Amino acid sequence: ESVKEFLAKAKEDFLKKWETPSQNTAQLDQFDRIKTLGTGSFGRVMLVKHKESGNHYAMKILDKQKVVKLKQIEHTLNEKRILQAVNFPFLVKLEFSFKDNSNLYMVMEYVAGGEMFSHLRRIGRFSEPHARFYAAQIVLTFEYLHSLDLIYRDLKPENLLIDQQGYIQVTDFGFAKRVKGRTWTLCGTPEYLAPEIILSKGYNKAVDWWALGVLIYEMAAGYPPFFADQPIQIYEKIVSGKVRFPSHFSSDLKDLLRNLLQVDLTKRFGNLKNGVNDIKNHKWFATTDWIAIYQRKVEAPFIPKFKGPGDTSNFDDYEEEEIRVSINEKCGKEFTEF
Amino acid sequence: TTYADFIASGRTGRRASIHD
């Protein structure tokens, strides 16, 4: 309806940026680095303050040598190329990007509410209305991303930030990829991998819908549907694919989850003839006003405490390390396009 | 309970991505 024209225009905007990416829009000495907000397997994100504007941002710093060592060059180029090109209410904005002799930098809006992860572990679990509010935003976000032929591949509470209005901001496009049809990389987070990833047969955007299943379950249960102490045991459970539900889950929720956590691709919601509408029109989401969610007019069920720009109280503390920059350029050719 | 078994497990903290 107005979704089609919306998405069509969205694609035009995205493609222009995808075709001619922004580069080199800031420099290191334009910011004062304050505190580490979070880390991933080979990245660190710091709260910084931009000198000339006074604004705070979140600076993701990647050591080029580590990226190379881990064979993540192409992924890293994907991450930045895609992030600089997208535009959606629940995707974090990339404000600047640049590189120096040693590191790559992606400077994003600072989302001060913290990871969904920390709130979820602390509180224990989210009620179904609360989980539903967040899930709706992810459904819309994947509808947008997929329409651009993008697959996100890293949905998890750790990569979802809560903004000052209580809405979600998706972060970490490390595994995002523009692909028409099928791909094969074993990547993601173990608990969230679709079986077809694990079984190495090639996969498509449907893996995102599976992961949404895992996210909804975890939000509403307080623990993932497939957990164990080591990744290998997790994969065994996923591939078995037997799911059990908490006693408090509604019938509607369970029915939705059986259709998302569905090994059979001919049967998995999101992957059928009716596409995302099989999800939007499911009884679990009957109370959801899809347009109002997009417009951010729904009252958030939780609104984290804010305490003044630069407040980091919604984030765990991390050990700090010096940001080295060598007088010798590292991996210059590899990252030419960054 | 499932909750107890989760909470006693080694994977209750922030989870790292994998990328092989």
Ligand SMILES: Nc1ncnc2c1ncn2[C@@H]1O[C@H](COP(=O)(O)OP(=O)(O)O)[C@@H](O)[C@H]1O
């Ligand atoms: N825009 C941001 N605002 C506030 N915190 C951020 C932002 N982006 C990332 N973070 C914090 O940094 C952590 C790591 O960011 P992430 O992009 O997931 O790096 P990685 O690829 O190394 O896992 C996130 O889990 C979150 O705690």
Ligand SMILES: [K+]
């Ligand atoms: K991450």
Ligand SMILES: [K+]
């Ligand atoms: K990442």
